[PDB]
Design a protein around this ligand. Structure first.
Ligand SMILES: Nc1ncnc2c1ncn2[C@@H]1O[C@H](COP(=O)(O)OP(=O)(O)OP(O)(O)=S)[C@@H](O)[C@H]1O
Ligand SMILES: Nc1ncnc2c1ncn2[C@@H]1O[C@H](COP(=O)(O)OP(=O)(O)OP(O)(O)=S)[C@@H](O)[C@H]1O
Ligand SMILES: Nc1ncnc2c1ncn2[C@@H]1O[C@H](COP(=O)(O)OP(=O)(O)OP(O)(O)=S)[C@@H](O)[C@H]1O
Ligand SMILES: [Mg+2]
Ligand SMILES: [Mg+2]
Ligand SMILES: [Mg+2]
Lengths: 329, 492, 318, 257, 258
DNA sequence: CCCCGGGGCCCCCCCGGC
DNA sequence: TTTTTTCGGGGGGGCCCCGGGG
């Protein structure tokens, strides 16, 4: 723990205040208004990984309190035991007792509550309801089916959407300015495309790209660096593979696939995913073609997930695509 | 001091005389006969029998569905014939330690209250052990101690329970008189309900009692509570409002394995008309009534029905084949569920794969009786034989080069010819050769028997061994015991 | 700001039995019991957010009054309710002597009784019968099948029903009047639609809408609150063309942040309650959805698997 | 604090009296009349009955106008009593229709006053009229010897048979470790009259009791100094231990013939 | 062994200090300066705060070049500290940028030397000044009497209410079996000045506290003969036990009353 | 120096969906 | 017309043994 410069970019660039959280305008505005007027309800932040839930709640707590929020809030996560005994004793005493340092209300943050047992969630119901006058609860979740209906009904739900492109571009610009780096527009587009709405992925990939460059001062991060560090297929490669599979004989398609994969050690799963994305735009004249494509490609993906014979898997991909498109005549 | 207007109707209009109890007259009379002649059995040392065979059992085991008058009947019989009641309920700790230091020290002691209150049995004790099934204890609950008391009690010990056919109460199999109380019929309860109706100033037409009783599954207490609640605002109970009351107060009891299997394998719940009354939710919930026995019962009883839901051109064989395929899929799902990952969220899917879907293809009318699962006993037998084979294999590991499967499939057929055939063909003279062969492989007599118990098909040795002359077997055993034999595993 | 204000769900919690909307028969009967007495042992069952606990508390208060402190024993899931608790504390409370008005009794409120072990419930049988002249028992549960039948036979069944649109609208309008909220009828309709009959959710959504943007209209209401995803899944599974179903899965579920596990579980539930489709087709769809769920639970969770599941469902429905 | 105002001269007396029969019964009925306090309690086994009388003489100051019955749980009473001080003044206070009693621990050396309240339990147990019984045999022997004999016999058997005849008392315990008999006879010694053993028998009798009940009975022997055993044909033995003003009697029922 | 070298009068002293609050908090953080050792620990429930302020005069010798922070686990510290005799001398040794703290046990009479090193834990503590509020009331009473009162009232109920009024201290506890109240007044004595109840009051106050925390705040009664309780309305309550050199303070948050 | 209260482990027994 | 597998959590019974009191 020397300084912040010796930290991963995912942690080095954690939003400190609520103004540094991007892509969640509605939720941020609503929670800030609640803190302003003092109408904070029991909150349930539901969202996919790396969207700004933990950061948002920590920033909210630091905004309500000062820099001593660590001692004025009860934050429990999956790394800590949260059984029925914990809910009955520790959470109950925290909710029913005044603040040692300040003279304000109390906040309990049950992060990763989806990992809690049903008994603990059931016990939390009346604990939440009874001490509502001086206590408020915040629950952060990724999957909603693991939360009991009673807990869901007792909390106001806020959904963290996948981060749009615009917020990702702004945060990438901020990181580039801070790190003194240059990013090509096509490199930026590839980074946002591979992000899948996750900022942690963007930060990790950007750190890897900075590492790849010989001298990060003058050199620029081109899409080539993106694909080299991520080891992902190139759009031209995917298009060429699809063209060879759909318009050439078996020998030519096999040779093209093998050459493309061996050029940079491209993985079969990435090629399958890219081809699926490409075919999504295709306007098929027969529903059977799309049905067969989806089913057979899903089966191939499931087989790949458990390993097996890679060459046979690639041949199966080629054959499935050809057979499915044979129904377009 | 307690105003009657503030008392519950169940306790207010409660039975006061043993005759007031409705239905189950035979059970009440049988209990009275058993308890009245208890002293006579004591004089006979409980050795002689009686007309009804009640003179040998030293304890009573009243049982029946809930809310029928079991505890009331027991207390009324204890108070009528004349006795002092020492009742123990689930609210009191009935563990083995407490039982030894509790009721045990009173089974053969006089009644201080009985004497200081004032009948030869008036000062005697009647211990009523109510809610036996409610004792939550397998090794520290003292159920076996209760059985011991029933076996060695100096006073009439009456046990009351709601469900006799449970493993927990197997110790009370044949150490007590099994008195059965059944659901009382509407005919006897109509008089009581009409009396309460006249007393409490609300209308109840004669045609409504049967339906109200069917609503509560013959629970007189529940019917009285129904009347008390409905009389709060609606003082008229006529045919115009039976449907709403019965639908709001319908009892929902969980069906038992046999009933679940019978209901599930019916072609009326799978019809386009019956599917609306009995929806998929109902079937999935019925699976969860007993989620450990339902799939086994379905797999055991899906081949003994005449179907009525077969598609045009489909035969019974194809339907059973499809059901078996889905049963195999459900078995795979079950293997996934009960694994290191602990995937219980898949339980609903299992319900569809193992129980609902396979039944929906062979649903119809039973062509026999619902048989209990045969896989449990077969699994126990397989485990026993596997342990025996393991013992035999590790007894011979120093003279053989194979595994247990290879030993079972390859070596044992030849070992039989070297161990049993000589007795059949030669006789007693072959004892020495068999002893030698068993000595070469560190084989014991019990190992010999276990080996002879493995063969199947035309090689079954039960009749062949039972036919061997007794002299040869006796000489074999005596010669083996008189000789010193080696040891393979020297357990220190 | 470090001084919060009470939420409307608590600030406007009904304190009398006449302020509870919905289940007119049961509420009127409870009012009659409160005015007369002789409260029977009762079990109140129903879905979340309907007013079971509120009704129980209002009845107990109106029945006892100044004796509420010494004549009510409230135990919930947050409090230990094991066999020892039942056999000692509840027994002592039942045996405790309290001089109450002529037609009043002590009350034991076992909230969330469905989370009690079978042993505790069995130990709770005779205490209700030998002390019925001094104490009465009220249970509030969501699932009524978790209470052992012997106890159910000892209590009056009160199965609360799902609240209708009229009751929610009435209560919401009353709260709006008491808080002077600017609203549009479309906003109230949207709030009711998204509440799904849960009064707590309706009030919370209304409060959030007012405190975030002011006017309660359809746009503002839907900006915070999203439409129930089960209905979206139902629409996706009932589409005619596979293209439309895939579009619904894509632009309405996948990109909104909904996880694949949630989508598959919701699809399973909806197909289980899809009365429109025949039972056999529903069973095959359930088989396919279960295959997809098993695939996802092993770590292979991707839009491709959901698309394949939809394609198989469409093939089955063709 | 109007109806019942009682003040023990020493608080330790109440603690000792309660502890004497604390392990015998669970719940008790203290009926406070104008003449004193009388309590009757039956154990869970419904075989041992306990009577207790405290008179005005033991009380430094007693004032009770109307008779009041107080149902108490001995565990809670012991808890509250242990919370007091031995060298303290204990005062029992009961008011109109008492739903609870007040125990006041008050001392004069210091000005610390501790006012505890104990909630009363609605005990539904009719008073079993203890009709006077002319027991056939009356045996009085020092509590020390009784305790010694019963404790020695406790390890022998779970049941002890007592036979009384001419200047002869036999205690026989036949259990799992063998059979042991203890024989005692009356004696009068001027050196230690308090330890003298006195027997008054008209017809010899023999009755078998349970060892555990006798042990629990003697557990309270520290209160008194001698035993007042009375035995009849088919009646419970009256183990009477006399205190300053009043008494504490056990009515241990016999075993079946 | 350069920065910190501190030898105690006897290991029993540090043992007693540790046992006074090892059942209340789990992770502690000492901040050793040239003036002594000060530690602040917060309970998991965030309801009880323990503050220890051992002084320089409690050591035979105490050397500390620079202020050094040590984060430690109380279970492990107590376990290691239980590996010594009651007649030995214990010295704490800490080096540059400490990664572990060395506990050396020495017995000159028996010429016995024992070593024990405990790895320190990275706790980013923010040691908070104990701002001395203008407490509404303060009092001093023998620790044994307070222990007796709390232990008696704990059985009745799980909460204890302290009311401070005009020369009157009321310890009340309402539970299930019944209620209890103990009233004590300021008593001044000259024959045995060690025992006395002193009260300095400005405004009357009434505060409820949990029995579980009070039962652990009294385990420090073995550390002193008198205890000082300072109470302020809707403010943390201070329970101070004065050591031979320093003091041990428990800050307890009054329970909410709604 | 010996007995009793009550904290702390150890062992076992049963559930698991909406 | 009768009776099985595994982790993890929770509950409930059983001692064990330190501490404190007498
Ligand atoms: N809205 C955001 N704005 C800026 N950075 C973000 C944002 N969301 C995520 N990040 C970045 O990703 C990192 C992780 O953010 P978090 O919100 O803490 O992750 P998370 O949402 O809690 O993950 P889950 O849902 O528990 S798997 C942050 O430190 C940021 O660097
Ligand atoms: N045959 C009956 N006739 C009249 N009332 C009955 C009858 N059976 C039950 N009841 C009524 O229901 C009340 C309770 O009956 P109980 O005998 O206590 O129940 P039970 O038969 O022992 O079953 P469980 O094990 O208690 S659920 C009685 O006081 C009666 O008021
Ligand atoms: N019938 C109702 N009338 C008015 N308000 C209601 C009603 N039902 C619920 N509410 C409101 O929602 C709040 C919570 O109601 P609850 O009584 O907690 O619902 P509940 O059914 O007990 O929840 P569960 O089943 O324990 S999860 C109340 O304070 C009311 O403000
Ligand atoms: Mg997080
Ligand atoms: Mg019964
Ligand atoms: Mg509720």
């Amino acid at each position: 723990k020397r300084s912040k410069e010796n930290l991963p970019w995912v942690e080095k660039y954690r939003p400190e205040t609520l103004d540094e959280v991007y892509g969640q305008n509605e939720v941020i505005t609503t929670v800030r208004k609640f803190v302003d007027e003092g109408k904070l309800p029991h909150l349930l932040f539901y969202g996919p990984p790396g969207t700004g839930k933990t950061s948002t709640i920590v920033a909210l707590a630091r905004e309500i309190y000062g820099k001593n929020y660590s001692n004025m809030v009860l934050e429990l996560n999956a790394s800590d035991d949260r059984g029925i005994d914990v809910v009955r004793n520790q959470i109950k005493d925290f909710a029913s007792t005044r603040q040692i340092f300040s003279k304000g209300f109390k906040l309990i943050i049950l992060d990763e509550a989806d990992a809690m047992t049903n008994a603990a969630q059931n016990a939390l119901r009346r604990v939440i309801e009874r001490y509502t006058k001086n206590t408020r609860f915040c629950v952060l979740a990724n999957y909603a089916h693991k939360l009991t209906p009673a807990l869901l009904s007792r909390c106001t739900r806020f959904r963290f959407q996948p981060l749009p492109q615009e917020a990702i571009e702004r945060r990438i610009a901020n990181v580039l300015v801070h790190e003194k780096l240059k990013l090509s527009p096509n490199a930026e587009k590839a980074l946002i495309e591979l992000s899948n709405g996750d900022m942690r992925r963007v930060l990790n990939v950007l750190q890897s790209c900075k590492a790849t460059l010989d001298n990060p001062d003058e050199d620029e991060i081109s899409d080539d660096v993106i694909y080299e560090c991520c080891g992902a297929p190139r759009p031209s490669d995917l298009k060429a593979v699809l063209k060879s599979i759909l318009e050439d004989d078996w020998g030519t398609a096999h040779y093209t696939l093998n050459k493309v994969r061996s050029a940079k050690g491209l993985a079969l799963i990435d090629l399958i995913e890219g081809i699926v994305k490409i075919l999504e735009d295709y306007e098929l004249q027969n529903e059977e073609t799309r049905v067969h494509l989806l089913t057979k490609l899903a089966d191939i993906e499931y087989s790949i997930s458990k390993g097996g014979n890679d060459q046979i898997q690639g041949s199966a991909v080629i054959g499935a695509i050809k057979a499915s498109f044979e129904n377009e005549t | 001091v307690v105003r009657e207007e503030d008392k519950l109707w169940t306790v207010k209009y409660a039975p006061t005389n043993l005759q007031q109890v409705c239905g189950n007259k035979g059970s009440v009379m049988k209990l009275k006969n058993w308890l009245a002649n208890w002293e006579n059995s004591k004089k006979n040392s409980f050795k002689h029998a009686g007309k009804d065979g009640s003179g040998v059992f030293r304890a009573a085991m009243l049982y029946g569905p809930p809310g029928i008058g079991k505890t009331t009947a027991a207390h009324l019989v204890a108070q009528e014939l004349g006795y002092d009641i020492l009742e123990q309920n689930a609210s009191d700790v009935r563990s083995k330690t407490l039982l030894n230091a509790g009721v045990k020290n009173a089974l053969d002691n006089m009644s201080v209250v009985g004497y200081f209150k004032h009948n030869l049995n008036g000062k005697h004790f009647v211990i009523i052990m109510d809610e036996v099934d409610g004792m939550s204890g397998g090794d520290r609950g003292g159920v076996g101690q209760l059985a011991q008391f029933c076996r060695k009690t100096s006073t009439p010990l009456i046990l009351i329970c709601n469900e006799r056919n449970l493993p927990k109460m197997r110790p009370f199999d044949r150490v007590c008189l099994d008195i059965q109380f059944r659901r009382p019929d509407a005919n006897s309860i109509k008089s009581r309900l009409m009396t309460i109706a006249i007393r409490e100033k609300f209308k109840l037409d004669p045609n409504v009692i049967d339906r109200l009783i069917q609503t509560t599954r013959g629970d007189i207490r529940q019917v009285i509570n129904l009347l008390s609640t409905i009389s709060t605002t609606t003082k008229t109970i006529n045919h115009e409002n039976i449907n709403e009351i019965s639908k709001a107060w319908e009892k929902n009891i969980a069906l038992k394995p046999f009933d679940i299997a019978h209901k599930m394998l019916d072609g009326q719940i799978y019809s386009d008309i019956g599917s609306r009354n009995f929806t998929l939710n109902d079937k999935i919930a019925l699976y969860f009534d007993d989620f450990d026995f339902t799939p086994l019962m379905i797999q055991e009883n899906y081949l003994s029905t005449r179907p009525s839901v077969l598609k045009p051109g489909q035969s019974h064989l194809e339907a059973v084949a499809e059901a078996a395929n889905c049963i195999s899929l459900g078995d795979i799902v079950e293997k996934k569920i009960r694994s290191s990952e602990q995937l219980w969220s898949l339980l609903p899917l299992h319900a569809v794969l193992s129980s609902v879907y396979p039944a929906s293809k062979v649903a119809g009318h039973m062509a026999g009786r619902i048989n209990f699962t045969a896989w449990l006993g077969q699994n126990s037998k397989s485990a026993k034989y596997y342990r025996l084979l393991q013992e035999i294999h590790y007894h011979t590991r120093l003279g053989t080069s194979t595994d247990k499967i290879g030993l079972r499939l390859d070596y044992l057929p030849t070992f039989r010819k070297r161990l049993l055939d000589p007795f059949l063909k030669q006789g007693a003279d072959a004892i020495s050769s068999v002893i030698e062969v068993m000595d070469d492989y560190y084989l014991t007599k019990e190992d010999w028997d276990s080996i002879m118990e493995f063969f199947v098909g035309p090689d079954v040795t039960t009749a062949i061994i039972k036919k061997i002359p007794a002299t040869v077997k006796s000489g074999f055993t005596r010669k083996y015991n008189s000789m010193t034999h080696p040891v393979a595993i020297y357990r220190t | 700001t470090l001084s919060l204000q009470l939420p409307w769900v608590e600030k406007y919690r009904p304190q009398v039995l006449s302020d509870i909307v919905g289940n007119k028969e049961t509420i009127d009967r409870l009012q009659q019991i409160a005015k007369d007495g002789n409260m029977p042992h009762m079990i109140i069952s129903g879905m979340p957010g309907i007013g079971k606990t509120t009704s129980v508390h209002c009845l107990a208060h109106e029945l006892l009054g100044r004796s509420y402190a010494d004549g009510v024993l409230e135990l919930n899931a947050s409090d230990d309710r094991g066999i020892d608790v039942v056999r000692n504390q509840i027994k002592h409370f039942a045996q405790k002597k309290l001089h109450l008005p002529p037609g009043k009794h002590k009350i034991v409120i076992l909230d969330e009784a469905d989370s009690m072990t079978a042993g505790a419930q069995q130990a709770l049988r005779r205490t209700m019968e030998l002390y019925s002249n001094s104490t009465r028992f009220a249970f509030a549960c969501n699932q009524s099948n978790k209470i052992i039948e012997p106890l159910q036979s000892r209590c009056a069944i009160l199965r609360y029903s799902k609240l209708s649109d009229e009751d929610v609208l009435k209560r919401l309008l009353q709260i709006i009047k008491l808080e002077d909220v600017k609203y549009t009828n479309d906003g109230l309709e949207a709030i009711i639609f998204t509440a799904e009959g849960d009064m707590r959710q309706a009030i919370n959504n209304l409060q959030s809408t007012v405190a975030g943007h002011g006017l309660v209209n359809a746009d503002n209401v839907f900006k915070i609150v999203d439409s129930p995803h089960p209905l979206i899944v139902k629409k996706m599974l009932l589409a005619s063309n596979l293209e439309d179903s895939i579009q619904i899965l894509r632009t309405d579920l996948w990109k909104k942040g909904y996880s694949s596990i949630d989508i598959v579980t919701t699809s399973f539930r909806v197909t289980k309650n899809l009365a429109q489709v025949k039972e056999s087709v529903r069973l095959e769809m359930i088989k396919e959805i279960g295959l997809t769920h098993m695939r996802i639970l092993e770590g292979v969770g991707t839009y491709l698997q959901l698309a394949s599941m939809l394609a198989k469902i469409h093939k089955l429905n063709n | 604090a109007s109806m019942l105002e009682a003040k023990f001269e020493e608080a330790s007396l109440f603690k000792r009296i309660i502890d004497g029969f604390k392990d015998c019964v669970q719940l008790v009925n203290f009926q406070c009349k104008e003449d004193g306090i009388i309590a009757q309690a039956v154990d869970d086994s419904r075989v041992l009955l306990v009577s207790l009388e405290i008179g005005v003489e033991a009380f430094q100051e007693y004032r009770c106008d109307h008779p009041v019955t107080l149902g108490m749980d001995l565990t809670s009473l012991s808890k509250i009593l242990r919370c007091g001080n031995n060298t303290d003044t204990l005062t029992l206070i009961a008011d109109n229709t008492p739903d609870s009693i007040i125990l006041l621990f008050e001392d004069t050396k210091k000005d610390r006053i501790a006012e505890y309240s104990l909630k009363l339990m609605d005990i539904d147990a009719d008073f079993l009229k203890i009709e006077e019984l002319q027991y056939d045999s009356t045996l009085s022997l020092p509590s020390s010897e009784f305790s010694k004999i019963v404790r020695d016999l406790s390890q022998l058997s779970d049941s002890i048979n007592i036979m009384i005849t001419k200047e002869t008392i036999k205690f026989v315990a036949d259990g799992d470790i063998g059979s042991g008999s203890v024989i005692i006879k009356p004696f009068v010694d001027m050196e230690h009259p308090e330890t003298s053993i006195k027997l008054e028998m008209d017809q010899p009798v023999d009755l078998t009791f349970g060892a555990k009940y006798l042990l629990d009975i003697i557990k309270g022997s520290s209160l008194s100094d001698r035993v007042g055993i009375r035995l009849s044909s088919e009646a419970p033995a009256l183990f009477q231990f006399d205190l300053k003003s009043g008494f504490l009697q056990f009515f241990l029922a016999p075993k079946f013939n």
